[PDB]
Each structure stands twice: as structure tokens, then as C-alpha cells.
Assembly symmetry: C3
Homo-oligomer: 452 residues x 3
Amino acid sequence: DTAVLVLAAGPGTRMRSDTPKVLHTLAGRSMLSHVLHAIAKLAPQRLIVVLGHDHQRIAPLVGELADTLGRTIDVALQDRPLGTGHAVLCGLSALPDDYAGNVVVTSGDTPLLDADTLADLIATHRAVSAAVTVLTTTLDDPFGYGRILRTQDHEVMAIVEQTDATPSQREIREVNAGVYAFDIAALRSALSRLSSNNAQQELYLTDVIAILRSDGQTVHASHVDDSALVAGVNNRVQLAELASELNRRVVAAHQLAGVTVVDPATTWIDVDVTIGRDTVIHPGTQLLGRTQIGGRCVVGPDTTLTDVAVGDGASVVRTHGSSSSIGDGAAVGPFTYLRPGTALGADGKLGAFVEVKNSTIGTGTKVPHLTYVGDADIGEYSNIGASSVFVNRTTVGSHVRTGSDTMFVAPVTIGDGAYTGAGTVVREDVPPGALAVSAGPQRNIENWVQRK
Amino acid sequence: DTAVLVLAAGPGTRMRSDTPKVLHTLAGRSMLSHVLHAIAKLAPQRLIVVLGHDHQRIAPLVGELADTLGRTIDVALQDRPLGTGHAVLCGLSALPDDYAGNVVVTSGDTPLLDADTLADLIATHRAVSAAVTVLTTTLDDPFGYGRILRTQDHEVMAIVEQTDATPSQREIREVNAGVYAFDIAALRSALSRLSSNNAQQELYLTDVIAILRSDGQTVHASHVDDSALVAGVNNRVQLAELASELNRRVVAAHQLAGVTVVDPATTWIDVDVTIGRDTVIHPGTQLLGRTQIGGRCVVGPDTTLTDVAVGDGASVVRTHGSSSSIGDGAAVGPFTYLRPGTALGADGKLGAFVEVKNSTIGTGTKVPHLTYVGDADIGEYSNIGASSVFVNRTTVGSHVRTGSDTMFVAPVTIGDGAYTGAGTVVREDVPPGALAVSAGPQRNIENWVQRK
Amino acid sequence: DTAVLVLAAGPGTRMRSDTPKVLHTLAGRSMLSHVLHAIAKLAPQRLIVVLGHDHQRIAPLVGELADTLGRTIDVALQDRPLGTGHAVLCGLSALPDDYAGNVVVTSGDTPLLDADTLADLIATHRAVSAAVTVLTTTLDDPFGYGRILRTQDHEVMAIVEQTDATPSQREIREVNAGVYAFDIAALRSALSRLSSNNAQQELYLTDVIAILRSDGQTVHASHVDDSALVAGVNNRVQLAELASELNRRVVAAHQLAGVTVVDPATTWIDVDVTIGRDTVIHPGTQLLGRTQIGGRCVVGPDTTLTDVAVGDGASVVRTHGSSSSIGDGAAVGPFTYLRPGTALGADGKLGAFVEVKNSTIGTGTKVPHLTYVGDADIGEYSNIGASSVFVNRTTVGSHVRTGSDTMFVAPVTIGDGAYTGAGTVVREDVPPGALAVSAGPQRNIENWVQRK
Ligand SMILES: CC(=O)N[C@H]1[C@@H](OP(=O)(O)O)O[C@H](CO)[C@@H](O)[C@@H]1O
Ligand SMILES: CC(=O)N[C@H]1[C@@H](OP(=O)(O)O)O[C@H](CO)[C@@H](O)[C@@H]1O
Ligand SMILES: CC(=O)N[C@H]1[C@@H](OP(=O)(O)O)O[C@H](CO)[C@@H](O)[C@@H]1O
Ligand SMILES: CC(=O)N[C@H]1[C@@H](OP(=O)(O)O)O[C@H](CO)[C@@H](O)[C@@H]1O
Ligand SMILES: CC(=O)N[C@H]1[C@@H](OP(=O)(O)O)O[C@H](CO)[C@@H](O)[C@@H]1O
Ligand SMILES: CC(=O)N[C@H]1[C@@H](OP(=O)(O)O)O[C@H](CO)[C@@H](O)[C@@H]1O
Ligand SMILES: [Co+2]
Ligand SMILES: [Mg+2]
Ligand SMILES: [Mg+2]
Ligand SMILES: [Mg+2]
Ligand SMILES: [Mg+2]
């Protein structure tokens, strides 16, 4: 059997945040969600998330995530901030006393930890018949991490916390990832022998290593060369360095699968985003949420799309949009705002300084300049003049030509093939094939300027 | 004599692209074009580009490039994907049998290879009286490249392909750039001795090295320290890493020549772009095509310009434009769209939420807010009110003041010094110095709001 | 006693600029200003800035800076470009002959030099009882810097200029930072023994080291590990590398204090900018000048703000603004332009394609689409229809609803709770609770399209 505990109990005081550390997000999931998704793929028999401060704020999101992953996720509360050693103990109490499996310990602030790393850890753990196996790695800057101590003979002695290391030890660049596999009897038995005489006056989980080494138990360290996989987040400088490392990888994966990305460093792609072959993404682009881009698209510089669906061969340039759909071969931008519920048919055009909200717009229809469309349904191959406003429901037919400077005052229906004169205010329905007008006739006042 | 072959025959399957590898672009030229420009500057007597898959799609662009560089470029077809060794052979068939020159082999996926490197290679080749000279370099990640094998005595033994190296050899970090100079008799004679018993069942050009070493011929390797100069492109992650390296260099060259670039990493400058002394470029700027910027300009953040000409001391801020000209001391932006054929005279202004298309706009005239100008010619020192539309030809005189919310319905002529009232629709000509109006008079309905 | 000289006398010819090197800016101060601020914090008894070329252009800004820092800053002119050795001499002439203090020499092209480094230098200088102490550092590329020469015994021999080093010496990677502390009698006495037989035919300050070593005086070098602290600026590639290093640090300091910064590399924050806890900054953001952001704000991608004040919990997305204030919980963007003098009350909204200039806008009022507001005061909880223009003073009351396509022709007053019909031109005052209209009635011309 195997059980995974997720240590999400700490305060994250160095985040300086009213929002709990473990719910800050990157690439579209919270850290906690990234950690849980990864574990879920490995499918251990039990899964326990230990919470402490802010638990009423984190618990409901653990339950939300248990439904999305379709499995039970238990929650063990930690009453006293008595250390991580104490947190494992709290977590074990959600396990039956008779429990015979392996226990794997993990935190929830390690968002790039993946299912293979855990697998390699369990496999290695079982292969060497070890009481405790710990993931290590080595870093340029090892600040804030337990250091790994070994004999002459390379044997793992102990783990010394940052607050507790001599200056001489603070130099050690092998670090404790804080990801372990334990034999359960050995874990139970060393947790009892933890004392809190140390710099933080806590029960260090990391003391368990020296303890089992004392009983002449087998202690294994498994070095992870790709340090990003087990990097943790304590503050916002680390949050962003890893949001950025994860972004590099998402982008590179899209590039190898056929997407041209002009500039990876300023192209942000959330984990659920799909993009078709031979589309080009220009720089300053964020593809967020469940956004889908077809193939042979152009996604223009300085574009932001959240939960937008874009068909094949469409261009979406300098566009700020969400919760909207854009058809094949359609043209959006530059300087275009899509609010929730915009659907633009195939071959359609929303141009410069156009805003659409909750509007359905038919195949091949063009709204190219300076106009607001909201709460409107517009038919096919229609053309909406510059400088207009759908004054919010309105329905507009197919093959319509509305003139510049038309205000459609909802609710109003414009019939197939109708026209509107420049500067018309439409307050009553327009029959198919009629010209609606309201502008007064021009009058020239000669020599007005000499006089005034 | 000297002949250059360009090996552009392969499939680029790892690009995952319906567009042939060698025609993907960076900084304004396709890879093929970058390679050919560089060779062209060296001016060898013959120049042969070997094509294979997609040759009907690549051939016409080779001919297009031969005219631009004003020299003959021959095309040798490779009938069977039988290897690069085979590709050199196909390429040699476009040479006369009596041919006595040096042959230099190059690919066309090496876009930063420059005329000096080739020169250094030919010079070195002749200096050491060598049968074969190959360019090498050393890399952090040597994946996918032939490895260079040497004796104890540092003598070049052979080149081993990635697919063919032992794990022990895959560690070697000296790589084959795939750029060579051959003595022709030696090249002909080792091409005949190539066999295809290897991992790809192809005729490896790289086997030619071991072969000439066998006949006790002179084999020279010339190490290139600047690895970017001979880096090749197999996939889109490599395309962008080098588009980015080339961009660093273009930008740095502009910085040393007097252009302030706030942020090189997000400033994209195509190779043909010229920029004057003491202009400042702010971040998120792309200067593409034959775009020219004068001096003491400000080019604002988040600006995209393609084949735009900008005079001296003009500002072009948050502007998306192409195929357009902007005069000295003019002001464009923020949030401004220039379509093809926009000319804005000196001291002119196109402001926020303005779109211009095919329009000529005179010295010192201002279009500052919320307006569409297309197919129009506007004179000098005129002022176009906010929220207007040139409803496309229209001509507007000099010293005009058109009021807000005016629709000029083409075709219409507005005389010098004329005015337009706020919300006028202009359908007939306006005499110089006349006030054109059409808006109805205001009426106040008192206490309407209590009633409704 | 202690006196600081700032060597700002050189020509900066490699800047290629009509603007003096030392006045090019980064993060909101000129280099000179950064250097002077840092020294000012240390508060030496005397402070002398030596000027040479362009001194009439730099002097008035030295005086401006003396008032801001509230202390006397003297200016010593250098008549002849006779070297840096000569420049120290010119600088000493502003000191009394009897002067007994330490002299510290600094340039003004070293913008990240900080008050601690100077302090460490003075302290070290006094601690070792040294005649001359020089700051050194070591670099990947030491080009253009004096090299540090030492015996077998690690004792500082001399400093050799770039123009003067053997190729063998050009390899030395310990460099002279050009920041020193001198015992004054020793400085006076070695300046007299400087001769100009060297590559630039100048009086090298750096020769002073070999000279004092000759008199068997104590020569100390103090190595600075953080090389950015003493990096100098000769050209625009170096200007931007350090503008970028300083930006990393400003941003990281905000991140550790509680600001989420999605992308540091494209987030530019000037030194005076303050940002509250738990605000998020998205990429492509510049926060320039005395800009202040409250807490829990969202500052949207692609935003530029200069001397903007933003309250708490407001969003400012895709906005280009300056000299303006935005209240708590207000919404600005996307695609919004704020000119000088915009004040938007708490809970207010300026939306897509809106431009405001010199306008005051009351609590909870919304200007959401396609409109120009300038020279206007608008009351509370009002709503301004899309596609409108304040045709500039206008006053608008509270709880107003103005319809789409309204032109307010200043000067005009709109009473509390008044309405305006769609497409109204307002030329006369509107009583509280009145409906102002001017649009003509709609007319449908049936079958117009068949006929035309
Ligand atoms: C359990 C413990 O006492 N210390 C751990 C632990 O420190 P924290 O301050 O709790 O983050 O996490 C580190 C791994 O992220 C690890 O290096 C260290 O050994
Ligand atoms: C009449 C109109 O064109 N737009 C209205 C309309 O825009 P929405 O996109 O529907 O939010 O409703 C808003 C009322 O919440 C109002 O601020 C705005 O003026
Ligand atoms: C001709 C050949 O057989 N192999 C060459 C060749 O491999 P390709 O898979 O054909 O790209 O190009 C490399 C240089 O880009 C070089 O390293 C290698 O030795
Ligand atoms: C009348 C007008 O102002 N603009 C027209 C006009 O803009 P262009 O910039 O010329 O493409 O022609 C288009 C017809 O292809 C049409 O979509 C748009 O409505
Ligand atoms: C005073 C002198 O003769 N040379 C100095 C000096 O060279 P400049 O060319 O004047 O920048 O500044 C360098 C420090 O930025 C230092 O390395 C060098 O030793
Ligand atoms: C009438 C109007 O709406 N806007 C005017 C008005 O804008 P300002 O934001 O005030 O610069 O004054 C300008 C005169 O300098 C003029 O170019 C523009 O047309
Ligand atoms: Co109107
Ligand atoms: Mg941690
Ligand atoms: Mg290749
Ligand atoms: Mg209008
Ligand atoms: Mg210098």
C-alpha cells in the first residue's frame, strides 16, 4: 500500500500576504493544485493534506480539488504550530493504526514536482529496502534549505536546518528537498524521539534522519539533477522565478509540437491551453485559462486571452479578451476588447477600437472601427459603420449596411439587407431592404468665420 | 577558383511545419536568405543550392534572391533522400567535370553564419594545404550534432553522428558545424567510397573525414569560438533562441551607434532597419521591414512599425502601423493604428483611438481623438474634431476646424478655413470660410425623469 | 574631516550623444543624481563635482541637486582635458590649502554605487592606516578598465590602463573600479609627480598607485564582490545592462515586501515608486516618477503610469497615464489614456477607448466606452453614454444619465439626475431631472435598396 501526506500547514509569513501561500497561482493553478494534480496521477491509496493556519480558507478548495480529480482527499488539521515533525504526526492520525503502507511526505509549495519524481522516489525507496529515503538536490544559493551532511564515506549522516547550521555548514550546497519516503513503523518510532531543542523550538521532521541513522536503519538520499522539480516557494521572488521556469517549459513543449513563439520570455501560456500546428505567437502574449487556438493562427503582439476559443487561420492582434469565441479565418484587432459571451463567426472582423459584450456576430460580418456592440445579435455578411453604438437586445439581419454614427436603441430589429444613413438614431424597426435615416439636412453659413 | 554549395535538401521534420524549414524567417529574412546574403558578400565564382523535398516551393525564392543579389544562383535537385554525402554529389553535377576550384559546403539552416567565417575557412584551408577543412565549435548541449573525434595527439580522426555515437561519445562537446572546405579531387574521390551502413541508412558527408584520413590526406579542423555563428536550426526552440541572439546583436549595434534602447530583450529590430542618433526606444517595440527612424525620436512603449518612415524628433507611442510615413516633429499615439498609405506631415498629430488608411495629412494638422480617416487628403494646420469619420475620396482644406461628431460623406470637399458644427453630417461641399451644420436644436423636457 | 570629489569632467564620446553622459537617466534619476544621492547619505564635510566639457549644461543641475539634498555642492571646473589625475587636482583647488581630511575620489557614471560601499572604503582606509585605498572588483569581460597588478606576494604594484596593457595584461580580470580614498598629503605629493608619457598622453590618476608604492607608502585594495555596485557607464549597452540590474533590485525589494510581480524582466519601477501589500503587477508595466499604488490593486498588463496615484483595490489595465489620481476600488482600462490633471473618484470607471484630460470625476461615476472627457467636472454616481465628447469647462451633476453620442459643448451645465437622449448636442444648460434631446425623428425609406 502507499500514502501521501501534503504538508500545507505553515504560515508563509515571508510571502507578506493576506492570501495563504499555497493558494497563490502560476500558469493557471494554485500551488496546492499543482502539487495535488501531480500526486493524483501517481494514484496512491491514501492522500492526506495537513492544514494549520488559514485551514477554513484552504479546506473547501481541497474538497473542490478532490471532485475534479475524482478521488477522496482527506484533511488532517494541525492544532499547534509545533513543527513539520509534528505535522507528519497530525497527518498520520487520518490513517488507521494498522496501516502497513509506505508514507511519502511532500509539501504543497513545490509546484513543479511531477509524477515521475515521486515514482522514482518510491521505486528507489523499495529497491534499496530503506527506512527513510530523502530527495536532495544541489543549488547555487542554498539559503533557507536544510543542508545534507555525509561522512567521508558519502553516507548521509543528518540534515541541518538553515537557522541551525554553523557558517561552515551554511556553505554546503547539497540541500534537503523536503520530499521523503518512509517505512511507517520506522516513521512512527522516530517521531516519538523528536525533541524541540533547536533554533525554532520546533519538532523538526529533518531530525528523523539522524534518529534512524542512530538505530542503524538504512538511510537513502536520491539526488534530483533538475532542481526546479523540487524547488519550494517561500516568498514572491521564488514564486515568479518558477512561474517563469514552468512557462519556459510549457512554451518549449508548444514549440517542439509546431508553434512558432517569437519570444518565449514574454509569452505566458497556462497549462490547459492548446495551440494548433503552425500558429505564430508574437511577443507580449498571455494565453490564460482554457484558451484554445486553432492552427495557422496569428496571435498578435500584446494580446491577452482568457478562456477564449480561436478557430483555425484567424488573427488576434493587440486584443484584450475573455470568455469568448472567434471563428476560423476571422480578424480581431488591433486595439480590440472582448467581454464575456462574444461569438464572432468565421471570416468575421472586429477592428480597431471596437468593444463587444454578450453578442453574437454572423459569418463574414465586419465591425471594423470605433464601435460598441453589446447584447446584440448580428446576422451574416453584414457591415456596421464606424462610430456606432448598440445602446443596450437588438437584432440585425444579414447583408445589412449600417452607416457611420448610428445608434441602435434596444430593443430594435434591423431587417435583412437594410441600410442606415450616416448619423441615424434607430428607435423603431427597420424593414428588410429599407433605408432608415434621421440626420437633418446640411446648411452652409457663408462667411461665418470672417464674422466670428 | 571557388564554389559554394548550400545544402537545403532535407525535410525539417522536427520543425513540425507545412512551411519548409529553410523559409522560416528571423529579423526580416528567411534562413535561406540569410545564408545566401552572407555567401554573396564573399562572391565565390559558383553558387549552388541543392534542393530536395519541397523544391517547387523553394526554387522560385532562390531565383528571386539571385536577382536581388545580382548574381547567378544555380539549383541542383536531389532526387533521392540518400543523405548529405549524396546531396554534395547532386550539387557537384551543376559544376563542369573539369572543375578545378575549392568546394565549400554549407547548409541553409545556419542563419548567423557570416562572410568572415567563410573567409577564415577558405584562407585556413589554403594555408595548411588541406584536403578537407571542417568548422567545429564546442557546446553546453551537443545533442543532435556530429561529434569531433581526435587521437591522443589532438589529430582529427573522424566525425560520429548523434544517432551513431556510443553513450561515451555522446559526452564529447566538440561538434561538427557542418561547414567545410574541400579540395575537389579529394572530395570526388571520397564520395565514391561512402557506404550507407549506419543508423540512418544514409550516405553521411561526415564519413568523408575518416576516409581522407585513411588515404593519409591532410584533415584540418578550424574551431569557431562564437558558436552562434554556426548554430543550425532543426526545431522552433532553436529558431527562437537564434532569432533572439541575432536581435541582441542588431540592437547592441544600434546602441553603440547612439540609440538608447531601454530594454533590448523586448526590442525587435529587423536587419534593414535604420535609426538616428539619440532616439530612444522604449520596451515592447518591434521595428520591422525597411522601417526608418530619424534622430531624437521617441518610439513609445508597445509600438509595432513595418515599413514605416519616421522623420527626426517625432514621437510614435503605443502605435500599430505599416507602409506609412510620419514627418519630423510629428506626434503619434498612444493607441493609434496606421494602415498602408498614411502620410502625416511634419508637426502633425494622430492621437488616441485614431485610425488612418491611405490618407495624406498636411503639416501641423491635428486628428487627436476617436476618429477614422481613410481615403482622404487633409491640408495644413487643420484640426479635426473628436469622434469623426471620413465615410469612404474627401479633400479637406487648410486651417479648417471640423467639429466633434462630423461625418464627411465622400466624396465631399471642405474649403480652406471652413468650420463644421458639432454633430454635422457633411454630404455637400463646404465653401472656404463657411460654417457647415446639420444638428437639430436642443430641447429640454422638464421633469421627464420624475415622470419616467 | 572627509571630502568627496566626483569626477564628471570627461566627454563620454562613446555614448554618441548630444546629451552629456552623466545626465542620461535610469530608474528615474540621471547618473549624476544617483551618484550624488548616495554620497549625500554618507554626509561628508565637503563635496566637489569636477566638470569639464558641457559644464554650462551640467552645473545648473548640480545646484538643483544641492537644494534637493539640502547641502552645499561645490563645482570645480577642469580647463584642459589633461586627464583624471589632472581632474583630481582641479577638484582639490576648491578645498582650502590647510585641508587635513581624507579625500575620496568617485566618478559620476557609476549609478549603483551606494552609501555602504563608500563607508566600507573609508572605514577600511582608516583601519589599515593607508595612503591610498582603491576599490577593485573582478569581471567576465574586463575591457576598458585599468587592470590591477600585484607581486607574487599579492601586494598591489600598480594599475595599467586598457590602452596601455600588454596583450598578456589585458587578460587580468581584477579591475580598478576608479573609486579611491587618499591621505591628502600623499595625494598632493604624487599628483605633482605624474607625467603624461602614456597612450592617451594624459595625466593618469591611476599612476598615483605606483608612485606611492615607490615612496614605500601603504597601498590598499578593497575587493567589492558585487561588481554592479561599481560598474561604470561608457556606452549605451552598459547603460541598459545596469538600468536592468537596478530594476531587478527595485522589483525584488517590492516582491519581498509583498507585491506580486508576474514578470520582473518586463516590469520597470522607478526608485521613488511605492506599492502596497498584495497588489499584482502584470507584465509590460512601467511605474515611473512618483507613482504610488495602494494595496490589493491590479496593474494590468501593458500599463504605463508616470506620477500617478492609485488608491487601494483599484484596477489599472492597459492604461497609458500621467499626473493623475485614481481612487480606491476604481476601474481603469483596457485601452485608456489619462492626461495630466485627471482625478477619478473612488469606485469610478474609465473604460475602453476613453481619454480624460484635466477632469474631475466623482465617486462611482462610469465613462465606460469610446469617449473624450477634457476640462470637465462630473459629479457622483453618474453615467456617460458611449461615443461622447466633452467639446472643450463643462459641469455635470450627480446621478446623470447621458445618452450615447452626446456632445457637451462647453461651457454647459448638466443638472443633478438629468438625462440626455442618444445623439444629442448640448449647447444650453440642462435643468436637474430634465431630458435634453436634439436628434431628428427616424424615417424609413421602403425599398430604397432595390431602387439603388
Ligand atoms: C522540515 C524542516 O525542519 N526543514 C525543511 C523545510 O524548511 P521550511 O522552513 O519548513 O521550509 O523545508 C525545506 C525544503 O523546502 C528543507 O530544506 C528543510 O530541511
Ligand atoms: C448604454 C451603453 O452603451 N452602455 C452601458 C452598458 O454597458 P455594459 O457593457 O452592458 O456594461 O451598461 C452599463 C450599466 O452597468 C453602463 O455603464 C454603460 O453606459
Ligand atoms: C552530414 C551528417 O551526416 N551530419 C551532420 C548534420 O546532421 P543533420 O541531422 O543532417 O543536421 O549537420 C550537423 C551540423 O548542423 C552536423 O553535426 C552533423 O555532423
Ligand atoms: C465606411 C467606413 O467608414 N469604412 C468601411 C471601409 O473601411 P476600409 O478601411 O476602407 O477598409 O471599407 C470597408 C469595406 O471593405 C468597411 O468594412 C468599412 O465599414
Ligand atoms: C583614471 C584612469 O586613468 N583610468 C581609470 C578610468 O578609465 P576611463 O577611460 O577614464 O573611464 O576609469 C576606470 C573605472 O571606471 C578605471 O578602470 C581606470 O583605471
Ligand atoms: C475640441 C476637442 O474635443 N478637442 C481639442 C482639444 O483637445 P485637448 O485635449 O484640450 O488638447 O484642444 C486641442 C487644441 O490644442 C485640439 O486639437 C482638440 O481638437
Ligand atoms: Co452622432
Ligand atoms: Mg518551503
Ligand atoms: Mg541542421
Ligand atoms: Mg458620434
Ligand atoms: Mg567610465
